[PDB]
Amino acid sequence: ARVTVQDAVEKIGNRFDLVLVAARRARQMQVGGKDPLVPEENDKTTVIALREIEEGLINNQILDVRERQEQQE
Amino acid sequence: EFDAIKIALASPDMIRSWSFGEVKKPETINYRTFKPERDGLFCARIFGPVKDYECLCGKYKRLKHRGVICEKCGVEVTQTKVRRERMGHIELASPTAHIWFLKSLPSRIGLLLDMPLRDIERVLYFESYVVIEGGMTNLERQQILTEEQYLDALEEFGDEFDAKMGAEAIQALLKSMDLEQECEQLREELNETNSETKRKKLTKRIKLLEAFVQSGNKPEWMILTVLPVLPPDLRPLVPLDGGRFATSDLNDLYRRVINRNNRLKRLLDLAAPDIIVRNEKRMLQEAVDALLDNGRRGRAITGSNKRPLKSLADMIKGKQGRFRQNLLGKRVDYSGRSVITVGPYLRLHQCGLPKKMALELFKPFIYGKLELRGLATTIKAAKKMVEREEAVVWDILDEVIREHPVLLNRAPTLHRLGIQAFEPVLIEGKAIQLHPLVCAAYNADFDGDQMAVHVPLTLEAQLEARALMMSTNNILSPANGEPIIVPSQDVVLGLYYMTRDCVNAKGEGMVLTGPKEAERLYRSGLASLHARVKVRITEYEKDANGELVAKTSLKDTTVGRAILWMIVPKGLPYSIVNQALGKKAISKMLNTCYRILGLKPTVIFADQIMYTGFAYAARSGASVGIDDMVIPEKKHEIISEAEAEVAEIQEQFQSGLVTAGERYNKVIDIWAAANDRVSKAMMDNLQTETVINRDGQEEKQVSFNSIYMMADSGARGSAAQIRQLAGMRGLMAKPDGSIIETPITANFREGLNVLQYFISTHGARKGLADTALKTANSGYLTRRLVDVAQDLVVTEDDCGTHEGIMMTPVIEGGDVKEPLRDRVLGRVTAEDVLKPGTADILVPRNTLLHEQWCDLLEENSVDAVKVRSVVSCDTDFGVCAHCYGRDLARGHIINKGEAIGVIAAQSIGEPGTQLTMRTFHIGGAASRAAAESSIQVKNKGSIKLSNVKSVVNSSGKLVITSRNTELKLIDEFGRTKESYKVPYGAVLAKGDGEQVAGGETVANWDPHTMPVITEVSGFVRFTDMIDGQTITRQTDELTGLSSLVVLDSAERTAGGKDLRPALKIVDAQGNDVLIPGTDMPAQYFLPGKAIVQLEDGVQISSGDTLARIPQESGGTKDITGGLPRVADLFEARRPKEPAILAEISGIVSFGKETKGKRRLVITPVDGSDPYEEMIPKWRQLNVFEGERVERGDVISDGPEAPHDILRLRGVHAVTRYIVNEVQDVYRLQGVKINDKHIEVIVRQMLRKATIVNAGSSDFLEGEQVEYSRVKIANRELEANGKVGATYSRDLLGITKASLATESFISAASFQETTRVLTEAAVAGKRDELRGLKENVIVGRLIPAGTGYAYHQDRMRRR
Amino acid sequence: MKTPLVTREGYEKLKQELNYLWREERPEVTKKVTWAASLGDRSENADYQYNKKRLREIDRRVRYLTKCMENLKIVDYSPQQEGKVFFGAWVEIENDDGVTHRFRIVGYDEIFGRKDYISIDSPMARALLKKEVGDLAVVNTPAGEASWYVNAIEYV
Amino acid sequence: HARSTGSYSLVTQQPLGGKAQFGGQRFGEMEVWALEAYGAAYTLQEMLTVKSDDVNGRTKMYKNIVDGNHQMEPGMPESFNVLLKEIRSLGINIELEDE
RNA sequence: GCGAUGUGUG
DNA sequence: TGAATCTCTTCCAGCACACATCGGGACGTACT
DNA sequence: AGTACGTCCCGGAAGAGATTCA
């Protein structure tokens, strides 16, 4: 359901941190359960993650926050 | 797991520690059974089992019994991997020279020993003898002797003597040599001696030695005592289909070595005679030599029938060694390849893929989803499922594909585009469908080209593709700013036909509200496609701060044009498409569309472009027929007239009015003129012939002849090609590069007569053949460049410095060639540029320069800008961001780590193909002759004169008597732009302070004569002239006149050979003309070998040239051109006849004019002047004794030596020189290449340096090491109180900077192996990775991108 | 097989063509080939072919005229030494049949219908070299020998 | 012609070349250059480590695939290991180190 | 289940 | 005497395919 | 009878002569 990554870069300047962030999130949403944060479209984890990103609510900050939190828990 | 790789020599005991036994029997296998022979190359109890966890005797076929060795056959039991890990050795019963250390040029052994390699050889292969501590004798230690010499010596000294011959000898030599007395004595020798080659040899020696001692090594180790053997697997005995075995060469080599060693063993115990044992040892040494490097020592030994068998060296080096064969690239699973086609129904973010092909590709994923849905318990069952190819399978396949990008590649993978990605859509057939646009990016027509596909297997990589490889994300080549989604032939023909007015057609000039209803008319056919028409339209201009204002209005346009308009995205202005939409047009169209509305709309717009294009193109049907190429009626007439002209010139020749040479030349020129006339005729009668009524009477208009359409479109072909279809095809050139005196009369429509076609044949075959060799040499260039930059990545954010280079736009006096805008764009300020209004901040000092600031500059018309460049960033082990500027394809600044190295490399490379092979380079020579004749000022400004001592001529003009005049061009502010030299006594067409415009000539003179200009007026006598004796009278036929040639000493008559003739201006009767202001008359003494025309008794005006001096000149740069010129630049080949420059600045003077390179002394204004320099007198000069010149200034004339440039002018200077030259080449062929790339190349081109003073350092003085290392060192060292070091950057050609790099494995993997590995091995050069090629080899991540994040985290952790 | 003698006006014209090409036509064709090679990049592309061929020709000619500007020797002499017809002379010659023939003699690199189109290294010239108003000039064309009478000598 | 997972050469545990031999494509030096030019890293690391060289990791990959765990573990390129043993056969010592 | 040489394709 | 200028001789010449052939002979025997 | 099994094997560029202004 996704054709480009432009707004993704717009939300994260590196364009590579983009990559790694997406990847971490993706491994989560494929192995670590933890259902996504957006109506899926039979799309794979990958696109799911990029879409979560351009919904401006997932990044490296949020990730490490939630990891530390769940780890405390 | 690990880190930096270490390398060193081989201690015999270290080897023993490696091995697990020693072969003794040369036999390979049983080949009666297939069991390996005991204690041989394949022996288990040395090496190990055949099949996993199975003894040879057949004892323990059981994991439970692992670990323990046998006792019957006595063999360990494990995985067969051990059969690969282990290694074996051989106790050679005699020492052996290691041929690498023996023959590398230089021989490490030799230099260590100070001995001619030839004689060291003569030692090794046993035809000599060498002393070993002979004692109180008449003989020297290193001394060597022959047979009879040795025998007489033996009889001269029976026992106390000591010498030997061969391996043992060399070994004892080295073991005897102490490595500290050497340091002492040789440093003393360098201190004392003076000879230059001595210095160089001795310094190489001392380098070798001090390094060797710094390591923990031992020289004798250079001699092998226990030669290891390769593990067996890697030399496997291939069982061919038959009772034979196509043995690997390694096997046979080891076999020979073993037989040899065994005969040697069996001999010694039997005390066989010395001649025999010598022959034995000799064969042994040669065999070991073969083992290591067959083919390096004399005749190689062959293998099967006649071809030299492969060796270990071979297995490393060469195009097909391990490096170039399996590590810098390799074969790869999960892939495929096919032929390609078009399928224009594909939103370019996708591409075709063959169904069968896919189903075979993703089989893993298939099995996965299969047993997820649970349709097969075991994997095997699913394998059967896929093979049966049942229904459910395909649905699952679609499922797994739906969003999983794949990679496409073409073969000639030239540049970054060369691999892209898509999302497949599954198609019938068996080929790959591929979007049309992306063709040109692939440089890939559909002539049958094969493309390959890869599939990322992992999730991260799926992201990789979708982020950095999905053609969407590449509209711009990182090479240069042009778009790369340019439409092409079909689609553009379409649009052309789709927007072009005729004068009169169905639906003429009606009115239409909605482009919708326009398309309605067209589909109805109730109104012609292209027709003049008034229509309402609506457009959107977004002047507001990110907000779109809608307006709407009526337009006088064409129906189809609107119909196109219904697809323009909401943004652009309407006027973009009012015109005819040529290729260039639609190019700008798409491009502006991008730059104004971002990316997503751009791509969707591109695909809509293609759709609508193909559509109306077909709907039109632009065919081509023979009648569609009109032969110009006047063609027959014109060529007949030309024939008559040829006859006229032929009559002139036959009547002897001209020689065959100018005959040839006249004929060719007149044919050329005729050709051009014909071209004009045909182009006219095509482009305009369409002439039709209008509801009036007539009118001419642009045509519709499909061929002219296809051209003016810009689809393919142009005036040129349509010419070679209709008019004559001009002239053709024989292989001589000459050009035949009879052109092609006819064209392709008519038939060529044989001889013509035959000529044009070789005419074209020349280039058609050229392209091959061209491709080859180009590729070599590319590779070399990549391995000079494979280890440079932007790492830190901001160096934070205040250095850089200047930029001025190049001008030919009139218009500018390089718009400073288009040279600076994308790069970043160095200082703050002051307003033209002096002392006013126009732009900040450390900020980007994008298009709007460029426009501001243009508005303010800035002369030059100081700007940062990668050349000199202060980064360590990398390059700071802001110094690199806009990564193209991404308007914003570079991202933290996108490794510019490789992209720059490619970008330089790719145009390779597109150069020419072999011509003469011209660039600097053009302006060269220009400035010779007369001065050319650049721009508008006033005039300033330095050292102006002159005199007004009779005409009122001015000519200069001071030999030191400088011309300064004044701006509208008060500084100076140009400071030109001034030849002596030039005809000044101007004067000081005169406000003149840009691009004008101000002076004039004979470019090749030292004038003898007067000083006063009055009559002329032969004052001091010696008649006949010194002078000579020379009557010249062609000029029908004589003159007075001034003969120099060796040429004038000997009588008064020292009597000097002169000339003094006199009054009306011969008295002295005292110079106004001085007391001496104006006598001028005449230098020899000159020419004088005027004779005695002539009135002359103040400021007249008297005599002339023939000034020799030669500009033979005739080894220069194109691709090889690029090569030689990045190579820094000292050109054939360099031009010398000023060592230091100051006053100059002559010296003792010894024949040959006479002398030239220099002296600083105050500093010491210990310097002189000898210069070949036969070479011309550009200076005189009284001159005072700047350092690094031109002295001789000719090509400009990069090395001396560096060591004199400056880094900025040299990088500017390189970039100007290379840009000149590529422009002379016209391929836009942003400078940044060449810049970074140069940066690597100077990554080493040498020393002058260590101060408090950790460095030997006469030493070479990278710039970065010393800079980081002395940085902290100066941070402490102690004093730093003095260095000197030294430029290296790429094919060198490669070699001496910090790392080695790269070099090892570049252009040669043995040299590098050996020098390392003696260096003990412990080596980190810190580099792409390195990690590629070891296969961990790459510190480039994503991997740059990885390495940052890791280095942070430790 | 060559003679560097040059007339002033011709040298001027040489500089003129040099600038015209290396300053105007070269940059035009430059822009042209650039736009043509905006990633067209086809060896078969005969547009690119012909364009680069014009490049090759203009380059050959510029190098030729460059070497010329280097070597060529100017003699722009006055009408002072007259009578002899050594060079740079408007000359008429006549034949038995009365073949009037007028021309000025200039340097090899000036042979055009522009001003005056007779060489100096030509055999005719070689004969004409040093003669007077009434001499009997003879040459030996590859068709044989022939002769003419001088009728005019003029300078400028 | 295509290939997923088939034979493997014997000297170097690498895929074979050609169609007749049921082998796969060749990712070439220039293509390595290319991927390097793109920031794409995991791509090339996967495409040199898993897809070719380690038998161990190759198997790990194939299994993890069949369980959807899109993942990889590099290990070491067995070919480079071969280079090591080869140079070591030459009179040169070469080693890895600690970390 | 290797390497040589050749032919052809881009 | 020694710093320049010839002159043998090692090293490299694009990428990716496809297909094809061919791969020791020689010298001498205990037998087959 | 005749042999399948034995051994047996053009450009560059940089170095070491080598030649010539001292």
Ligand SMILES: [Mg+2]
């Ligand atoms: Mg093709």
Ligand SMILES: [Zn+2]
């Ligand atoms: Zn056993």
Ligand SMILES: [Zn+2]
């Ligand atoms: Zn910097």
